[PDB]
Amino acid sequence: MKSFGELIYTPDRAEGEAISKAATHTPKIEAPEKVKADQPFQVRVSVGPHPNEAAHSIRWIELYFYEEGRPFNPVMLGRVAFEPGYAEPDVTFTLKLKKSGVLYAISYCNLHGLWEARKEIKVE
Amino acid sequence: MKSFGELIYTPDRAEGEAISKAATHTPKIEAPEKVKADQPFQVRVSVGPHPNEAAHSIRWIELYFYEEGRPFNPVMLGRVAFEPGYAEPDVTFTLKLKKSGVLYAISYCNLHGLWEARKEIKVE
Amino acid sequence: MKSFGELIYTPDRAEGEAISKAATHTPKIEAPEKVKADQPFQVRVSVGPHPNEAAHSIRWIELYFYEEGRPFNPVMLGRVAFEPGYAEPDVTFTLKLKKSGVLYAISYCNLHGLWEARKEIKVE
Amino acid sequence: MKSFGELIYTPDRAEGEAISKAATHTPKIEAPEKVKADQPFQVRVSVGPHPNEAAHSIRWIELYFYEEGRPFNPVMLGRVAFEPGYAEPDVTFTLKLKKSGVLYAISYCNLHGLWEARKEIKVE
Ligand SMILES: [Fe+3]
Ligand SMILES: [Fe+3]
Ligand SMILES: [Fe+3]
Ligand SMILES: [Fe+3]
Numbered sequence: 001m002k003s004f005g006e007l008i009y010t011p012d013r014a015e016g017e018a019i020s021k022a023a024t025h026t027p028k029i030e031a032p033e034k035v036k037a038d039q040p041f042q043v044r045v046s047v048g049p050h051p052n053e054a055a056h057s058i059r060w061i062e063l064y065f066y067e068e069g070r071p072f073n074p075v076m077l078g079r080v081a082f083e084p085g086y087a088e089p090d091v092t093f094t095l096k097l098k099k100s101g102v103l104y105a106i107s108y109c110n111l112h113g114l115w116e117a118r119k120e121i122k123v124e
Numbered sequence: 125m126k127s128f129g130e131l132i133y134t135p136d137r138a139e140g141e142a143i144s145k146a147a148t149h150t151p152k153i154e155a156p157e158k159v160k161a162d163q164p165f166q167v168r169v170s171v172g173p174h175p176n177e178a179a180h181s182i183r184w185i186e187l188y189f190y191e192e193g194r195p196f197n198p199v200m201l202g203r204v205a206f207e208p209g210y211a212e213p214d215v216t217f218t219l220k221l222k223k224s225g226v227l228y229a230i231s232y233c234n235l236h237g238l239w240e241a242r243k244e245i246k247v248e
Numbered sequence: 249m250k251s252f253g254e255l256i257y258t259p260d261r262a263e264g265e266a267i268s269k270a271a272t273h274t275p276k277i278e279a280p281e282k283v284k285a286d287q288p289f290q291v292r293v294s295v296g297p298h299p300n301e302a303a304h305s306i307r308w309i310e311l312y313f314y315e316e317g318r319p320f321n322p323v324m325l326g327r328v329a330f331e332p333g334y335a336e337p338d339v340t341f342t343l344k345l346k347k348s349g350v351l352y353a354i355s356y357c358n359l360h361g362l363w364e365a366r367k368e369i370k371v372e
Numbered sequence: 373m374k375s376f377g378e379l380i381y382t383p384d385r386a387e388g389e390a391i392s393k394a395a396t397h398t399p400k401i402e403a404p405e406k407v408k409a410d411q412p413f414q415v416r417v418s419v420g421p422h423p424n425e426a427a428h429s430i431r432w433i434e435l436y437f438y439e440e441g442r443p444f445n446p447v448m449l450g451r452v453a454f455e456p457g458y459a460e461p462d463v464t465f466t467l468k469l470k471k472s473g474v475l476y477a478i479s480y481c482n483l484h485g486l487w488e489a490r491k492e493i494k495v496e
Contacts, residue, residue, distance in 0.1 A: 001438075001474055001490065001492070002438065002474075003377075003380070003382055003385075003488060003490070004377070004380060004436065004446075004476045004478060004488045004490070005375075005376070005377025005378060005379070005380045005488070006377060007377070007436075007438065007445055007446055008375075008376060008377045009444075010375060017443055017444070018444070021444075040212050040214075052220075054302045054303045054358075055302050055303070059448075063211075064376065064379075065210070066374065066379065071389060072381075072389075072390065072393075072483065072484045072485040073379055073485055074376070074379050074485065074486070075207065075210065075482075076207050076431075076480060076482075077207050077210050077211050078204065078205060078206055078207060078210075078211040079204070079205045080202060080203070080204045080205075080215070081202060081203045081204075081329075082202050083199065083200050083201050083202060083358075085220070086189070086199065086201050086202075086219060086220055086221070087187075087201050087202040087217055087218065087219055087220070088164050088218040088219070088220060090164075090218040091204075091215065091216065091217060091218070092168075092215065092216035093211055093215060094211065094212040094214040094215070095210060095211055095212070096176075096209075096210060096211075096212065097210070102373055102374070104376045106376060108448060110302070110331075110447075110448075111444065112444045113444040113445055113446065114446070116375065116376045116377070118373065118375070118376065120373070125350065125366070125368070126314070126350075127253070127256070127258055127260065127261075127364065127366075128253065128256060128312065128322075128352045128354060128364045128366070129251075129252070129253025129254060129255075129256045129258075129364070130253060131253070131312075131314065131321055131322050132251075132252060132253040134251055137251075141319055141320075142320075145320075178426045178427050178482070179426045179427070183324075188252065188255075190250065190255065195265060196265070196266075196269075196359060196360045196361045197255055197361055198252070198255050198361060198362070199358075200307075200356060200358075205453075207482075226249070226250070228252045230252065232324060234323075234324075234426075234455075235320060236320045237320045237321055237322065238322070240251065240252045240253070242249075242251070242252070244249075288460050288462075300468075311459075313458070323455065323458065324455050325455050325458045325459050326452060326453055326454050326455055326458075326459040327452070327453045328450065328451070328452040328453075328463075328465075329450060329451045329452075330450050331447065331448050331449050331450055333468070334437070334447060334449050334450075334467060334468060334469070335435075335449050335450040335465055335466065335467055335468075336412050336466040336467070336468065338412075338465075338466040339452070339463065339464065339465060339466070340463065340464040341459055341463060342459065342460040342462040342463070343458060343459055343460070344458065344460065345458070
C-alpha cells in the first residue's frame, strides 16, 4: 500500500482533481534567501485564497527544516492551528537558524488533504 | 486546592517570586484599538527576552477571545507551538472579528507557568 | 474586567446555562489515588455524551499538574486534539510523577467554552 | 531537492544509521482488524522503549486515515503531544470509522526525526 509520504500533495506531482486545487492549498513561503547564523529573522507563510468555515478551512500549518549535515532530519520548527471562521491561514514566524538547509511548510485542509511547499535558505 | 483559573499568572496579580518573572513571561499584544467587522487585521504577540533551550523556553502561546453577547465564552482563536532553540516566541496572526470583546494571550514556560495578558478590541 | 481564569467553567462554580451544560462538558478523570514515584500509570479522561460534528465537538483536552513544592505551577502533562466526527473525546494517557499534587483536565467545546475537573494524586 | 514525504522514516526503507533506531522509534499500533461503521472502538499507539528527557523524547504522535474512495486523502484523526519527563509515548484513542482504509501513526523524536507505522482496518 501507499506510505504516508506518498500522500502529501505537491504542485509538481498534482494529479487529477488535485491539479485544480494546487494554487489555493499550497503554502506560500516568504523568507530571505540568506541569513546569518543565530540571528532572528521572519518567515511568513500564507495559504489561499480559501474558504474559512467550520465545514471547510485550512486547519493548521507545520514548519520543518532539513538541516544540512544532521545525522537525522528533519527538525520541526513550529506548528500553528487556526480556529475556523476567526483566524486566517496567514502567519509570521521568527526563526533562528544555525546551518543551511531547506524550509518545509505543510498545511492541512480538512476536505483537501496535506500540501507541501519548500524553500532553500542559506546560512552564513 | 486551587481551581485551574487561580493558577494563571497575571502581572497585575504577581506575588512572591512571580514578581521578578513577570516582565520576561507576560505576553505583549500589539493590535489595533478598533477594527471593522469581518475585516482581516494582524495581531502580533511576543514574549521575552527569554531563554530558548530544550531545558527552558516558551513552549507555546494560545489566543482566546471573549465575544460580547456570546452565551458561552471564551472562543479560542489559535495556538502556536515553538521548537526550543529554533523558533522565537514572537508571532503575528491574522484575525477576523464580528463583535467587540477582549483578546487574551496565554504563554507557557515549562519552568515558570502560565502567563495571561489581555487587550480590548472594538468592532465597528 | 474579567480575567481569563475567571472564564473557565467549573461544576463547582457553574451557574446559569453553565449548570445544565456541565454534565456533558466536564471532563471525567479516572486515575489511581496513590502511585509510586517515577512509576508509569494510566489516566483516562473522557467527556460526554456530547455531539461530534464539524459545527460542534470537543476539540481538545489539556492535562495539567499542580506539583506540591514546585516554586511555579502548573506543569502541562500533555494535550490531545480530536478531529470532528472521527475521534471521540475519550483518551488514556500514561504518566509518571515524582511528587504528590493535583491533576487538572481542561476540555474545549467550540460552542460552550472551557471546562475544568481536578483530582488529587498522592505519590509515595 | 528532497520532498518532505521522502524524509519520513519507515523500517523497510531505513538507510544506514537509521536502521538501528527503527525498533525504538517506529510507532506500534494495536487496533482491531475489523470494526462496524460508526461504532466506537479503541486504538492504542505506543513508541519505544525510548528515553523521556527534555533533551531527548518522543514529542508527539499524529494519527491519519486513508479513507477508501475519498476524493482527497488522508483525514487527520487526532494528535497528542507529550511533556518530556512526565508523559510516556503510549496512548489510547477512541475512534469511529465510516469506511475501510489505512490507519497511519507518525511519531516525532526531537533528535531522530519522523517515523511512520501503518495498519489496514476493514469497516463493515
Ligand atoms: Fe480546501
Ligand atoms: Fe521562564
Ligand atoms: Fe458543547
Ligand atoms: Fe530518539
